[PDB]
Structure formats: C-alpha cells, structure tokens
Design an enzyme around this catalytic site. Structure first.
Site, PDB file in Angstrom:
ATOM      1  N   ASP A  39      11.031   2.431  -5.739  1.00  0.00           N
ATOM      2  CA  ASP A  39      10.166   3.546  -6.158  1.00  0.00           C
ATOM      3  C   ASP A  39      10.858   4.461  -7.162  1.00  0.00           C
ATOM      4  O   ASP A  39      11.546   3.972  -8.036  1.00  0.00           O
ATOM      5  CB  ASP A  39       9.778   4.321  -4.896  1.00  0.00           C
ATOM      6  CG  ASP A  39       8.535   5.175  -5.080  1.00  0.00           C
ATOM      7  OD1 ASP A  39       8.407   5.890  -6.101  1.00  0.00           O
ATOM      8  OD2 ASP A  39       7.669   5.149  -4.173  1.00  0.00           O
ATOM      9  N   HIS A  69       8.152  11.283  -5.132  1.00  0.00           N
ATOM     10  CA  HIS A  69       7.398  10.236  -4.486  1.00  0.00           C
ATOM     11  C   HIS A  69       8.285   9.293  -3.626  1.00  0.00           C
ATOM     12  O   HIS A  69       7.975   9.001  -2.460  1.00  0.00           O
ATOM     13  CB  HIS A  69       6.609   9.468  -5.557  1.00  0.00           C
ATOM     14  CG  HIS A  69       5.749   8.390  -5.013  1.00  0.00           C
ATOM     15  ND1 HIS A  69       4.413   8.572  -4.724  1.00  0.00           N
ATOM     16  CD2 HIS A  69       6.027   7.096  -4.718  1.00  0.00           C
ATOM     17  CE1 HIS A  69       3.907   7.439  -4.267  1.00  0.00           C
ATOM     18  NE2 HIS A  69       4.868   6.531  -4.249  1.00  0.00           N
ATOM     19  N   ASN A 161      -4.843   2.402  -5.037  1.00  0.00           N
ATOM     20  CA  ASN A 161      -5.713   3.566  -4.796  1.00  0.00           C
ATOM     21  C   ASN A 161      -6.960   3.680  -5.691  1.00  0.00           C
ATOM     22  O   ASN A 161      -7.340   4.767  -6.102  1.00  0.00           O
ATOM     23  CB  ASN A 161      -4.895   4.853  -4.924  1.00  0.00           C
ATOM     24  CG  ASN A 161      -3.727   4.894  -3.955  1.00  0.00           C
ATOM     25  OD1 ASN A 161      -3.799   4.362  -2.841  1.00  0.00           O
ATOM     26  ND2 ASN A 161      -2.637   5.514  -4.377  1.00  0.00           N
ATOM     27  N   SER A 224       0.303   4.283  -0.841  1.00  0.00           N
ATOM     28  CA  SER A 224       1.742   4.394  -0.953  1.00  0.00           C
ATOM     29  C   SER A 224       2.385   5.161   0.226  1.00  0.00           C
ATOM     30  O   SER A 224       3.592   5.081   0.441  1.00  0.00           O
ATOM     31  CB  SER A 224       2.038   5.038  -2.288  1.00  0.00           C
ATOM     32  OG  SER A 224       3.387   5.382  -2.338  1.00  0.00           O
TER      33      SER A 224
END
Ligand SMILES: [Ca+2]
Length: 279
Positions: A39, A69, A161, A224
């Site tokens: 990530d 994130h 998403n 996520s």
C-alpha cells in the site's frame, strides 16, 4: 480474551450477530505469523503497533507513509486497539505514492518482492498479504497475485469501490486469491462495494476506525478496510493451527456467517468473515 468497546468491525468478526461492541479472540492473537501490507507504507513508529511494524520495501524516495491509508490498513490487521491479530508482525511494502497511486509495474514488483522476502522473515505460523488496491482488469496484475499466493502467502485483495462487478478489476478478479467485499454495521453490503461471482467473502468496510499517520486515528470506509479484517483473521487462524496460506480463504468462507447480509446481488456470496471464537 475480550476487548470491550472495540471498533464495530472487530466485534462483528467475533459475533454471530450485529449490534455488539466487544471483540473476543484467542490470546495467541496471531503470534508468530506475518502480515505484509502492500500500500502507501506504514508509520511504524505509531505507539499502536508496539514495535511489531517495520517497512521492508519502498519504490519511492521515502518509505514513510505520507498518505495514511497504508497505516490505517495495517492498524486493522494488527494494531493493539484496532487490529484483528494483535500479536502479528507487520511488514509494509510501499507500492503506492503519497497520493495513493502506483503504476501496475510497481505493484507487480511489490507482489514478487513479498513472495521472495517471506524467506527472509521469521513467520513459523504462516504468511499473509493484504492488498487494498485496485485498477482495471490486467492479466499481468492477476498473474502476479496468483504467484504470490502459490508461493505460500495467503493473499487477500479488496474487491474495489465502484459498486460494479469485480470481474472487471485486478487483482480482484484473480480466482486463486481471496477477494473481499465491504459490509456496514447493520449487515448491509456497503453502497460502494463491488460484487460478483469473483468475490470470496465480506468484511467490515464502512466507518472503520484505525490508526493514521502523525500518530493519530480516524474512521474511513472502503473494500480496502474490509480486506485487512480478512487478512488479520487469516493470520490469527493460522497461528491457531486451524488452517494454512493455501486454504485460509476457503476455510474462512466455510466458517463464515452465511445469508446474513442484505443488498447482496443475485450470484454473489452471502458470507461474512467470522472467527468462531468460543470465548
Ligand atoms: Ca478471487
């Protein structure tokens, strides 16, 4: 063990029903497993990781998480307060820049890195990778996720998403990894969650409280956020001897809460990750 007033997602993962706020889990807690978070990186120094987090790789000018994130994801896997596996080792691989973007080539190199790098780590109980990232279908991206999995790493990836069929997204569409949809606290599919026959499982994805950069915390949403619940659960189950990298996704789907979610489209699994912990 019982963690009172846990984040709702943690309570949910240890419950047969929605609406409760205590997290129950075996005290082994993922000890002796490893989870790679692939990530934007991980703020390892966050008090919530307690020395168990390390950056092992970056493709950019720094390995620090300049976004938040990846740190959030990592905290859901394994922070002491917000994590599923409170005693796991966390390894951060920064394939996304501080805007949360990365080219497909970098992401692929990051997957291949973990597939080798797990031979340099101590994880007697098994290895997991949490990949909360996504883009349009690419067979090269799918194929890299499939290598990571065949090398002996439990791979979990965000469904995406887009509120769309995940067949059109990578690595979400790769059949050999665990593709994770998002649900909310009232047991409805998250309104942004992708769906499809390629999904393997759902985890908590809406309003998920976890660590953030600058040593803080925040609530955010996404497949996520669901992914690291399943990643953490695999690590936890593997240290319990219940399963292995190769069969963890399968086992999680077999032991899930079934038919409990609402707004699941015809043909998508109605399975919610669950640790079956008998306290
Ligand atoms: Ca899959």
């Amino acid at each position: 063990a019982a963690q009172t007033n846990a984040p709702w997602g943690l309570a949910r993962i240890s419950s047969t029903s929605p609406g409760t706020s205590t997290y129950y889990y075996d005290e082994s807690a993922g000890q002796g497993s490893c989870v790679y978070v692939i990530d934007t990186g991980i703020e390892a120094s966050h008090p919530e990781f307690e020395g168990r987090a390390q950056m092992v790789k970056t493709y950019y000018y720094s390995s620090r998480d300049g976004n938040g994130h990846g740190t959030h994801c990592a905290g859901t896997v394994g922070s002491r307060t917000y994590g599923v596996a409170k005693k796991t080792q966390l390894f951060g691989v920064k394939v996304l820049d501080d805007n949360g973007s990365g080219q497909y080539s970098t992401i692929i190199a990051g997957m291949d890195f973990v597939a080798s790098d797990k031979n340099n780590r101590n994880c007697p109980k098994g290895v997991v990778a949490s990949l909360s990232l996504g883009g349009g279908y690419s067979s090269s991206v799918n194929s890299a996720a499939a290598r990571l999995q065949s090398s002996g790493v439990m791979v979990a990836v965000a469904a995406g998403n887009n509120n769309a069929d995940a067949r059109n997204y990578s690595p979400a569409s790769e059949p050999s990894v665990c593709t994770v949809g998002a649900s909310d606290r009232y047991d409805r599919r998250s309104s942004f969650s992708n769906y499809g026959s390629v999904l393997d499982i759902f985890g908590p994805g809406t309003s998920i409280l976890s660590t953030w950069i600058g040593g803080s915390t925040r609530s955010i949403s996404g497949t996520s956020m669901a992914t690291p619940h399943v990643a953490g659960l695999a690590a936890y189950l593997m240290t319990l001897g219940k399963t292995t990298a190769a069969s963890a996704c399968r086992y999680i789907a077999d032991t899930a809460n079934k038919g409990d979610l609402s707004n699941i489209p015809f043909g998508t699994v109605n399975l919610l990750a669950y640790n079956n912990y008998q306290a």
